[PDB]
């Protein structure tokens, strides 16, 4: 659910979502790290979890348009840098 | 290089033309107090058998060395003043006899603060030399010069220490040597070709 | 199984002139031939090749004709002149892989259990390589079939031998690199990389456009790989990354500074030498 | 399971596991599974579930050797306790990044001073990396980061990106080949 | 080195006539080597000119040799061996710097007629330092620029 930016989440959020108290949540994430479902690292003194990689999943046809738009405004940066580098260093060889 | 080359106490001093051996030993200890640091001052000038045997006949120089080494800063100043008086009228030390002094003092200041972190300037009054205002002025004028990296707060009279990285100091020297060499090479370039 | 394949220019020239001499007769679309080469460790080398009569109908993709006796006797005939070569695979000059490729690969897998398919483009228009290398494999998934035959790509490159190198050097009189230095290190590496990356992104754009409006055979492995791609982009706004970047750049510039200083000194020395040596030449004429 | 952790012990465990006749005896297979999986129990459940299981059957003679002998029993029980606490330390160092001291003592079923005493000899013997500040009760498990390593990881990530982007397109073309041929 | 030859008969030479009647001057552009003259050649056979036919398609195809993929031009190398290489280069630069002035001072204390022969057995820093400078500048500049554009091409 959370975006790639600001993926850090707290213990109390897990406690409320999973309907358990705090003292077990570590073990839960431990299990989630053991079987390789999710990859990350966990802190204890500050009650924070740093989540990094989660398994992919299937999704409908109205969600891939987001990836299409992301490619849309991704290709333009490459094109712009191409043009800038080509024009700036022209006389180095015609 | 002077203190480096003066390791001939044991390799003979037959050059009695210029001076006698006792003056040679005094000169070598005076320059060894400048050039080299504690891990070598404890290995070459404090452990030498011949230099210690000669120094045993000179109470003043032995006291002046042990005061610095044994961390008796109070008695250090009398010996420093006597030595600088001696070398002011002495040959080949007069034209810069001040500069030498301006090292030793600040050197001692850098040899005490590096162990603690928040030593007050009140302790320095009875541990280093009387006069809080004098210590304050000296510390301020040495901070302003860019050396003796520390800081002082006067509202509560507390001295704090810091540890700058050894990359800043290793950068202004490069830039200034580069500037001097560039000036010299430009002068050389336009001396020729009218 | 196979890691890299190396292709000599000889087979490229043979492909080109075979295509020319067989397409001049009539309007054929695809031609087929068999390659010869060698193995060492996991690296494959291709040396030479010969053609073979092949026929295919555009009406249906299930009818085609090859010759067995021709291939057998021609291999036997090339055996008598050089015994080091051996059958390794086949090539077809189609612009893109066809449906019948699996059937032909199965047909001539008899002569080599590790046949490798090579596609050569006869009229390239870009800077990319003209050759593509594929190998058969059996793939397994959840439902539909326990195994299915599928091609997988293998890295390819163009090699050269000493005699081949001198021949191609004699043939390439007109075109030769201007300078070797920062020029060839920059344009031949960076701008071409930008070109290729943009082309790849455009192709994947096209495929993604084909979905959710048109045909729509939603495939899931492509989606998984797209998620993996879009998840692996690093973040350059982090403070520690910026600090490390600045530290390394500042560390690097000093060396260029020093080298420029040395070059200036050497130039001044050369100027002094020339002026001194040349000012002492006018008086010798009297 | 008494051997201290090493690669030779690890591959010997892997080779000795998965025996067709080993399943004839389930309890020691369970012990091997417990010692080969992730984070292990504190001390109590295994001593309460396998202490009595080392007296019955027709194979408990090495178990009776381990218990009944006084000096051997004491030494081997101490060794087993050390092994299990070492396993817990290794796993919690692998998964955590910074931990309080009270929780560390709690998970080991022993007091805080014995916790620091048991980690001090380990860290001075150069087997694990740990930095404990005992004015705030904090333990740090991660090394300082050099400027080279961050950029090296960045470059590796870039290389993986390029490789996987290259991989996607060929499968794209192969998928497209069988839908718009005619 | 490729040559082409055809044979002649001696009976026609007995008639006081020579083969290969000449109608233009484009047949005598290359003088034969002395070893061809040593053997039979003109008294037994005659050489003919040669040419290579070139077209655009094969020539355009053939220039793909040694071309590299778009991946090779975007990798930015390890940041650990680079500093080792720079450190290695700087030390020999220092040593050549120390050795330069010795040869600079004695450049004119000896007559210049034997100046060139004086540099026949031992190396000279002046020629032996420029290559260091060049390689060092090139490597540093390209390594900087690659990372420079890569920081923004990807995200």
Swiss-Prot record, chain A:
Modification N6-acetyllysine occurs at: 16
Family: Belongs to the proteasome subunit S11 family.
Functional description taken from the UniProt entry: Component of the 26S proteasome, a multiprotein complex involved in the ATP-dependent degradation of ubiquitinated proteins. This complex plays a key role in the maintenance of protein homeostasis by removing misfolded or damaged proteins, which could impair cellular functions, and by removing proteins whose functions are no longer required. Therefore, the proteasome participates in numerous cellular processes, including cell cycle progression, apoptosis, or DNA damage repair.
Subunit comment: Component of the 19S proteasome regulatory particle complex. The 26S proteasome consists of a 20S core particle (CP) and two 19S regulatory subunits (RP). The regulatory particle is made of a lid composed of 9 subunits including PSMD13, a base containing 6 ATPases and few additional components.
Name of the protein: 26S proteasome non-ATPase regulatory subunit 13
Upper taxonomic lineage: Eukaryota, Metazoa, Chordata, Craniata, Vertebrata
Curated annotation (Swiss-Prot), chain B:
Task performed by this protein: Component of the 26S proteasome, a multiprotein complex involved in the ATP-dependent degradation of ubiquitinated proteins. This complex plays a key role in the maintenance of protein homeostasis by removing misfolded or damaged proteins, which could impair cellular functions, and by removing proteins whose functions are no longer required. Therefore, the proteasome participates in numerous cellular processes, including cell cycle progression, apoptosis, or DNA damage repair.
Protein name: 26S proteasome non-ATPase regulatory subunit 6
Full-length numbering of the shown residues: 196 to 389 of 389
Top-level taxonomic group: Eukaryota
Gene (name only): PSMD6
Complex formation: Component of the 19S proteasome regulatory particle complex. The 26S proteasome consists of a 20S core particle (CP) and two 19S regulatory subunits (RP). The regulatory particle is made of a lid composed of 9 subunits including PSMD6, a base containing 6 ATPases and few additional components.
Record family assignment: Belongs to the proteasome subunit S10 family.
Domain PCI: 1-166
One CC-aspect GO term: ficolin-1-rich granule lumen
GO process annotations (BP): proteasome-mediated ubiquitin-dependent protein catabolic process
Key words of the record: Proteasome
UniProtKB/Swiss-Prot annotation, chain D:
Task of the protein: Component of the 26S proteasome, a multiprotein complex involved in the ATP-dependent degradation of ubiquitinated proteins. This complex plays a key role in the maintenance of protein homeostasis by removing misfolded or damaged proteins, which could impair cellular functions, and by removing proteins whose functions are no longer required. Therefore, the proteasome participates in numerous cellular processes, including cell cycle progression, apoptosis, or DNA damage repair.
Name assigned to this protein: 26S proteasome non-ATPase regulatory subunit 12
Family under the similarity heading: Belongs to the proteasome subunit p55 family.
Organism: Homo sapiens (Human)
Connected disease: Stankiewicz-Isidor syndrome: A neurodevelopmental disorder characterized by delayed psychomotor development, intellectual disability, behavioral disorders, mild dysmorphism, ophthalmologic anomalies, feeding difficulties, deafness, and variable congenital malformations of the cardiac and/or urogenital systems.
PCI domain span: 1-146
Modified positions (N6-acetyllysine) in chain numbering: 94
Subunit text: Component of the 19S proteasome regulatory particle complex. The 26S proteasome consists of a 20S core particle (CP) and two 19S regulatory subunits (RP). The regulatory particle is made of a lid composed of 9 subunits including PSMD12, a base containing 6 ATPases and few additional components. Interacts with ERCC6.
UniProtKB/Swiss-Prot annotation, chain E:
Gene name for this UniProt entry: PSMD14
Protein name, per record: 26S proteasome non-ATPase regulatory subunit 14
Family the entry assigns: Belongs to the peptidase M67A family. PSMD14 subfamily.
Residues with the Phosphothreonine modification: 111
Keywords: DNA damage, DNA repair, Hydrolase, Metal-binding, Metalloprotease, Phosphoprotein, Protease, Proteasome, Ubl conjugation pathway, Zinc
One GO process term, biological-process aspect: double-strand break repair via homologous recombination
Enzyme class: hydrolase
Record's GO cellular component terms: cytosol; cytosolic proteasome complex; extracellular region; ficolin-1-rich granule lumen; nucleoplasm; nucleus; proteasome accessory complex; proteasome complex
Tissue expression per record: Widely expressed. Highest levels in heart and skeletal muscle.
Subunit structure: Component of the 19S proteasome regulatory particle complex. The 26S proteasome consists of a 20S core particle (CP) and two 19S regulatory subunits (RP). The regulatory particle is made of a lid composed of 9 subunits including PSMD4, a base containing 6 ATPases and few additional components. Within the complex, PSMD4 interacts with subunit PSMD7 through their respective MPN domain. Interacts with TXNL1.
Signal peptide: none
Enzyme Commission (EC) number: 3.4.19.-
Organism: Homo sapiens (Human)
Keyword DNA damage found: yes
Gene Ontology MF, one: metallopeptidase activity
PTM-bearing positions, type Phosphoserine: 69
């Amino acid at each position: 659910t959370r975006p790639a930016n600001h993926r850090q989440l707290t213990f109390e959020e897990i406690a409320k979502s999973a309907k358990i108290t705090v003292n077990e949540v570590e073990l839960l994430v431990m299990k989630a790290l053991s079987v390789g479902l999710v990859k990350g690292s966990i802190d204890e003194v500050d009650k924070r979890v740093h989540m990094t990689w989660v398994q992919p999943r299937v999704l409908d046809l109205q969600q891939i348009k987001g990836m299409k738009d992301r490619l849309e405004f991704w290709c333009t940066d490459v094109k712009s840098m191409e043009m800038l580098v080509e024009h700036q260093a022209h006389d180095i060889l015609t | 290089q002077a203190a480096e080359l003066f390791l001939d106490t044991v390799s003979t001093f037959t050059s009695y033309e210029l001076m006698d051996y006792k003056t040679f030993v005094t000169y070598t200890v005076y320059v060894s107090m400048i050039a080299l640091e504690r891990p070598d001052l404890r290995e070459k000038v404090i452990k030498g058998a011949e230099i210690l045997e000669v120094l045993h006949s000179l109470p003043a120089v032995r006291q002046y060395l042990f005061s610095l080494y044994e961390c008796r800063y109070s008695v250090f100043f009398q010996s420093l003043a006597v030595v600088e008086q001696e070398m002011k009228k002495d040959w080949l030390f007069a034209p810069h006899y001040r500069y030498y002094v301006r090292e030793m003092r600040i050197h001692a200041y850098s040899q005490l603060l590096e162990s603690y972190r928040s030593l007050t300037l009140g302790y320095m009054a009875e541990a280093f030399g009387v006069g809080v205002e004098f210590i304050d002025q000296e510390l301020s004028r040495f901070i302003a010069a860019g050396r003796l990296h520390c800081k002082i707060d006067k509202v509560n009279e507390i001295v704090e220490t810091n540890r700058p990285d050894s990359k800043n100091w290793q950068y202004q020297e490069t830039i200034k040597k580069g500037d001097l060499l560039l000036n010299r090479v430009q002068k050389l370039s336009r001396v020729i070709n009218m | 199984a196979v890691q890299k394949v190396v292709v000599h220019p000889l087979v490229l020239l043979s492909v080109v002139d075979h295509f020319n001499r067989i397409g001049k007769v009539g309007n054929q679309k695809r031609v087929v031939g068999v390659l010869l080469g060698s193995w060492q460790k996991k690296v494959l080398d291709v040396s030479n090749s010969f053609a073979v009569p092949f026929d295919e109908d555009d009406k249906d993709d299930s009818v085609w004709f090859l010759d067995h006796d021709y291939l057998e006797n021609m291999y036997g005939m090339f055996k008598k002149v050089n015994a080091r070569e051996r059958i390794v695979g086949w090539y077809h000059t189609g612009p893109k892989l066809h449906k019948n490729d699996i059937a032909i690969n199965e047909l001539m897998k008899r002569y080599c259990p590790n046949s490798v398919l090579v596609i050569i483009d006869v009229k390239p228009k870009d800077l990319g390589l003209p050759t593509e290398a594929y190998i058969s494999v059996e793939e397994v998934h959840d439902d539909g079939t326990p195994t299915s035959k599928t091609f997988e790509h293998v890295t390819s490159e163009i090699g050269a031998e000493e005699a081949e190198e001198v021949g191609v050097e004699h043939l390439l009189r007109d075109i030769k690199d201007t300078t070797v230095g920062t020029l060839s290190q920059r344009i031949t590496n960076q701008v071409h990389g930008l070109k290729g990356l943009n082309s790849k992104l455009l192709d994947i754009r096209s495929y993604l456009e084909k979905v959710a409006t048109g045909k729509l055979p939603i495939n899931h492995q492509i989606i998984y790989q797209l998620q993996d791609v879009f998840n692996l982009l690093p973040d350059v706004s982090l403070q520690e990354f910026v600090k490390a970047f600045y530290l390394k750049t500042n560390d690097q510039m000093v060396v260029v500074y020093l080298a420029s200083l040395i070059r200036s000194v050497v130039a001044l020395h050369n100027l002094i030498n020339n002026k001194i040596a040349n000012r002492d030449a006018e008086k010798k004429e009297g | 399971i008494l051997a201290p952790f090493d690669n030779e012990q690890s591959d010997l465990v892997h080779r000795i596991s998965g025996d067709k006749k080993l399943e004839e005896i389930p309890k020691y297979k369970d012990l091997l599974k417990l010692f080969t999986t992730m984070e292990l129990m504190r001390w109590s459940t295994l001593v309460e579930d396998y202490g009595m299981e080392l007296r019955k059957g027709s194979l408990e003679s090495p178990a009776t050797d381990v218990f009944g002998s006084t000096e051997e029993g004491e030494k081997r029980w101490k060794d087993l306790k050390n092994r299990v606490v070492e396993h817990n330390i290794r796993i919690m160092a692998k998964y955590y990044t910074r931990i309080t001291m009270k929780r560390m003592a709690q998970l080991l079923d022993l007091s805080v001073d014995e916790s620091e005493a048991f980690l001090s000899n380990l860290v001075v013997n150069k087997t694990i990396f740990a930095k404990v500040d005992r004015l705030a009760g904090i333990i740090n498990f991660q090394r300082p980061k050099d400027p080279n390593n961050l950029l090296n990881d960045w470059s590796q990530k870039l290389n993986s990106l390029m490789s996987l982007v290259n991989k996607t397109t060929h499968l794209i073309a192969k998928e497209e080949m069988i839908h718009n041929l005619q | 080195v490729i040559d082409a030859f055809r044979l002649i008969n001696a009976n026609m030479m007995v008639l006081g006539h020579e083969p290969r009647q000449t109608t233009s001057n484009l047949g005598h552009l290359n003088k034969p080597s002395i070893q061809a003259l040593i053997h039979g050649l003109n008294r037994h056979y005659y050489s003919i000119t040669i040419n290579y036919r070139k077209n655009e398609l094969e020539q355009k195809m053939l220039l793909n040799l040694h071309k590299k993929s778009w991946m090779e031009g975007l990798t930015l190398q390890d940041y650990s061996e680079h500093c080792k290489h720079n450190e290695s280069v700087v030390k020999e630069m220092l040593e050549l710097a120390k050795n330069y002035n010795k040869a600079v001072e004695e450049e004119d204390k000896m007559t210049p007629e034997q100046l060139a022969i004086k540099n026949v057995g031992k190396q000279d820093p002046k020629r032996h330092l420029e290559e260091h400078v060049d390689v060092l500048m090139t490597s540093n500049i390209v390594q900087c620029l690659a990372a420079m554009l890569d920081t923004v091409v990807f995200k």
